[PDB]
Design a protein around this ligand. Structure first.
Ligand SMILES: O=C(O)C(F)(F)C(F)(F)F
Length: 6
């Protein structure tokens, strides 16, 4: 999985 970036 590629985590989101905020
Ligand atoms: O981590 C994932 O979901 C994946 F698709 F396997 C990646 F290719 F990005 F590594």
């Amino acid at each position: 999985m590629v985590g989101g970036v905020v």
